[PDB]
Design a protein around this ligand. Structure first.
Ligand SMILES: O=C(O)C[C@H](C(=O)O)C(=O)C(=O)O
Ligand SMILES: O=C(O)C[C@H](C(=O)O)C(=O)C(=O)O
Ligand SMILES: [Mg+2]
Ligand SMILES: [Mg+2]
Lengths: 414, 414
């Protein structure tokens, strides 16, 4: 039992659908493997600057380190990549932030980030994606992208119910299917790997309610449901209709002229949030070709994964992209990139993802003013062309700063 | 039994791994629903011009119309969307070309294009994607994209083994899984839709052999295997390793320095084709950010679907993209877009996909010179800015030609 609690500090508390943030919250952070080691400090510093600038010394976060990944095997045991105690702690502390986690191949360990999302049941995975002025982009008009992806987390093929080809479990899921279910469309059973894709009504509805409710809450223009429903009828296809049914019975959506698009009024502003839908392979196109038609996006696990990383590259934000996993009893904000071992310890990586995820946490905790300062340090440093090797290698006349030095430059721009 | 055979003409013939094209082949073509009606003529004309220019009246294609879609219900019966006779005929005639097919909702009919791919077993779906100079693009450097996608067709989630939520078949595939297989990771069984994803060894190997063999045959630089293997271990993950194993035992690939990338020598040119792999969500990024690292791409059905349409938009070729479905006993080349009923009969659509698919057919039939003329009519007309509303609305000082008028402009540019 090896975490050392900050002695000064209090736990974030939940008062029935509200958080109760102390002035001094203890916030767990997993340092992160690989380059986790450079960005997590650049984040600790520029957020500790952020609450000291905004609440003028009245608020203070009590950082408490936890482990997962590779840092649990060098602390607990050579075989522990996710302690049970880590699960307890995100749950009790309510909020945690984390850098990148490596998952060993060769040992039975599923992707550790998905392991955390499922075991804690962080059903919403909220990944903003917008253009910061001056960010090097592949695209001609990156400023039309300002979208919000609510990839569902607990479900879809992405859960990992899969059995190895020519094992027994693989062998008799197929024997069951060929005989008992009468399945004819498996071309080759012999030496065939089988995966299972779930998509329930509850897991769909709960994700889409948080998608509509965020578009109400921030006076956004639309919630697009993305799905490859025209082939995946009773999973993706179902997510679309459930999505719609909840829009209609819970938020009272009106049919728009012939449909299936609905008009939900935004009760506060009286505006109309549109509820369209777009089939998953065309959506990947409409985001480079009509990016300004999209605003909030709701989708199942796999498509949110791809849609996110596609949209993140369009805005040159491969490593500036923030992201969270919000659940109902806790929320864990994360670096959306991997560990980089060739660059790790070299202090050259971009800490922008994790610092922008730290921004998403602070706004969630209610500390608006702190979060806002970090959003300006960020906009300032990047449009001041005083940047880090990934932007700089593509940015004319940029000054090259090390990861730390870029943390520094966000602070001075606050 | 309602197809009217061209009386003059001969069937394409297969002489053991070779086609035997008459001077006058009968080639079936399905006209195509919706706008199929404008493009299929613009294609018939600019290909009939193409063999008359190149073989100087010595060759002639005997067009034979067949039906599927909506045109089978108005010819055979109100309920027939794919006649059996259509399947016989692509198989006997060896080659067919087709425009867009609408699939009715409300009647049990799966996506008709996937219905054709499975029932005829057109396992390879070969979708080129390159930049034509002067094509309006969202991206800054579309000229670095010249890629070839071999999306596997017969398998993956895309086959459609799925059971409706709260039906009995859905209900006891889940009872089977919870009890007999010991599955714990379905968060919500109640009212859950289940899909099944197959990925065999044979269906993977056969697709990857045609991917390597095309990169040998055209002196391409690399075959990238794309897969979301890091979560889909015994399907996608397996496609990757099979892919690799076939590269290694069949085409004798060498380990490159530590791997898993292999060096296969191209026997003809003695060059080295590289066999890399890239995880499916990062691949969607590396195509806008390093497009020149990719050359041939091999992947399972679903990812080839998305990868294709994403890459097609990057080169402004949403409707210029060609594509085939090659099988072992026949090959069916197709318009890669939908039917457009708002624009249909208005003769304003871009026929470029279907005409470029007609080009891919002619080269396949061995008529190189004809295919090549169509590739120049195409390059000429578009860099002569004498184009159709989709390019024109984004192209300064373009002349606006109707679909027909653009077929015309390709001919005059031959
Ligand atoms: O596990 C990882 O590191 C990759 C992760 C996923 O596969 O779910 C990812 O890319 C994402 O979080 O979207
Ligand atoms: O059936 C269609 O019309 C869409 C088709 C698919 O879903 O397989 C497609 O988009 C493609 O052919 O790639
Ligand atoms: Mg991802
Ligand atoms: Mg498609």
């Amino acid at each position: 039992s090896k975490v050392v609690v900050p002695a000064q500090g209090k736990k974030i508390t939940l008062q029935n659908g509200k958080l109760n943030v102390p002035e001094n919250p203890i916030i767990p952070y997993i340092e992160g493997d690989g380059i986790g080691v450079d960005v997590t400090p650049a984040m600790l510093k520029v957020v500790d600057a952020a609450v000291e600038k905004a609440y003028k010394g009245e608020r203070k976060i009590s950082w408490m380190e936890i482990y997962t990944g590779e840092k649990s095997t060098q602390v607990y045991g050579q075989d522990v990549w996710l302690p049970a105690e880590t699960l307890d702690l995100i749950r009790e502390y309510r909020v945690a932030i984390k850098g990148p986690l490596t998952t060993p191949v060769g040992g039975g360990i599923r992707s550790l980030n998905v392991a955390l999302r499922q075991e804690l049941d962080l059903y919403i995975c909220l990944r903003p994606v917008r253009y910061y002025q001056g960010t090097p982009s592949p695209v001609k008009h990156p400023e039309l992208t300002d979208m919000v992806i609510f990839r569902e987390n607990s479900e879809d093929i992405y859960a990992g119910i899969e059995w190895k080809a020519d094992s027994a479990d693989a062998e008799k899921v197929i024997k069951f299917l060929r005989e008992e279910m009468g399945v004819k469309k498996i071309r080759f059973p012999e030496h065939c790997g089988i995966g299972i894709k779930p998509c329930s009504e509850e897991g769909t509805k709960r994700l889409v309610r948080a998608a509509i409710e965020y578009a109400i809450a921030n006076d956004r223009d639309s919630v697009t449901l993305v799905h490859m429903g025209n082939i995946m009828k009773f999973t993706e296809g179902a997510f679309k209709d459930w999505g719609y049914q909840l829009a209609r019975e819970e938020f009272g959506g009106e049919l728009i002229d012939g449909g299936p698009w609905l008009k939900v009024k935004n009760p506060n502003t009286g505006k109309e949030i549109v509820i369209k839908d777009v089939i998953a392979d065309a959506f990947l196109q409409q985001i480079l070709l009509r990016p300004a038609e999209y605003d909030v996006i709701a989708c199942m696990n796999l498509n949110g994964d791809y849609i996110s990383d596609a949209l993140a590259a369009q805005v040159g934000g491969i490593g500036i992209a923030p992201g969270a996993n919000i659940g109902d009893e806790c929320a864990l904000f994360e670096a959306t990139h991997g560990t980089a071992p060739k660059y790790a310890g070299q202090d050259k990586v971009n800490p922008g993802s994790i610092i922008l995820s730290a921004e998403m946490m602070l706004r969630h905790m209610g500390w608006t003013e702190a979060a806002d300062l970090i959003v300006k340090g960020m906009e300032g440093a990047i449009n001041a062309k005083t940047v880090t090797y990934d932007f700089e290698r593509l940015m004319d006349g940029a000054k090259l700063l090390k990861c730390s030095e870029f943390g520094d430059a966000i602070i001075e721009n606050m």
